[PDB]
Design a protein around this ligand. Structure first.
Ligand SMILES: NC(=O)C1=CN([C@@H]2O[C@H](COP(=O)(O)OP(=O)(O)OC[C@H]3O[C@@H](n4cnc5c(N)ncnc54)[C@H](OP(=O)(O)O)[C@@H]3O)[C@@H](O)[C@H]2O)C=CC1
Ligand SMILES: COc1cc(Cc2cnc(N)nc2N)cc(OC)c1OC
Length: 165
C-alpha cells in the first residue's frame, strides 16, 4: 500500500545486540557520521524509549516518535501512535528510516524494503536485540569496512540489503 520506501537503520553485534541498559553498548562516532550521512533530509522513526535515550531532536531530519501515550509532546518532533499514523504523516515521503529500538523494529518488521545494517565484530553484553529475520527474497547489494582507529576501536562493516519486492 504505502508509497514511501520503508528502510531500516541499525547497528548490531555478532549476536544481534543493539542495546544495553537503555543505551548503546559501544562508542563509534564514525558510524554515526555514516548514519547522519545516509539519513540526511529524511524522516527518522523512533520508539519513545529510543528517542528519550537520544534526548533531543536530530537536525535536518523529520523526527517522529512512536508512543501509546496520547498526551505526549516534544518540541520540533512529531508524535505518532500507530504504524498507520506514521504512514499518514509520511504519505508523501520518498524514503523513511525506522530507527529503533527493538519494539519499534518489531512493529515495522512486515513493511521493510531496504535494510542498512552495520555489523560489528565483537560480542557485547546487552539486553536489547535486533529481531531475527527471514532473509528469503533479500539480496545483499553493498558491503564496506568501517573506519577502525583510536576513536572507533572495533572492526565493523556497513551492509545494505534489498528485498526483491
Ligand atoms: N544499535 C542500534 O542500531 C540501536 C539501538 N537502540 C537501543 O535499543 C534499546 C531501546 O529499544 P526498546 O527498549 O525496544 O525501545 P523502543 O525504542 O522500541 O521504544 C518502545 C516504545 O515505543 C512505544 N511503542 C511500542 N509499541 C508501540 C505500539 N505498538 N504502538 C504505539 N507505541 C508503541 C512505547 O512507548 P511508550 O511507553 O512511551 O508508549 C514503548 O515504550 C536502547 O538500549 C537503545 O539504546 C535503539 C536504536 C538503535
Ligand atoms: C545518532 O545517535 C544515536 C543513534 C542510535 C541508533 C542507531 C545507531 N546506529 C545505527 N546504524 N542505526 C541506529 N538506528 C541510538 C542512540 O542512542 C544512544 C543514539 O544516541 C547517541
Amino acid at each position: 500500500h504505502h508509497h514511501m520506501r520503508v528502510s531500516f537503520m541499525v547497528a548490531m553485534d555478532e549476536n544481534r545486540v543493539i542495546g544495553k541498559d537503555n543505551n548503546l553498548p559501544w562508542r563509534l562516532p564514525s558510524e554515526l557520521q555514516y548514519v547522519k550521512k545516509t539519513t540526511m533530509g529524511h524522516p527518522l522513526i523512533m520508539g519513545r524509549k529510543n528517542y528519550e535515550a537520544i534526548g533531543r531532536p536530530l537536525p535536518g531530519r523529520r523526527n517522529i516518535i512512536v508512543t501509546r501515550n496520547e498526551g505526549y509532546h516534544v518540541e520540533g518532533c512529531e508524535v505518532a501512535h500507530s504504524v498507520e499514523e506514521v504512514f499518514e504523516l509520511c504519505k508523501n515521503e520518498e524514503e523513511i528510516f525506522i530507527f529503533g529500538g527493538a519494539q519499534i523494529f518489531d512493529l515495522f518488521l512486515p513493511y521493510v524494503d531496504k535494510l542498512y545494517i552495520t555489523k560489528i565484530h565483537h560480542a557485547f553484553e546487552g539486553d536489547t536485540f535486533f529481531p531475527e529475520m527471514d532473509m528469503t527474497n533479500w539480496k545483499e547489494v553493498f558491503v564496506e569496512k568501517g573506519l577502525t582507529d583510536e576513536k572507533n576501536p572495533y572492526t565493523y562493516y556497513y551492509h545494505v540489503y534489498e528485498k526483491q519486492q
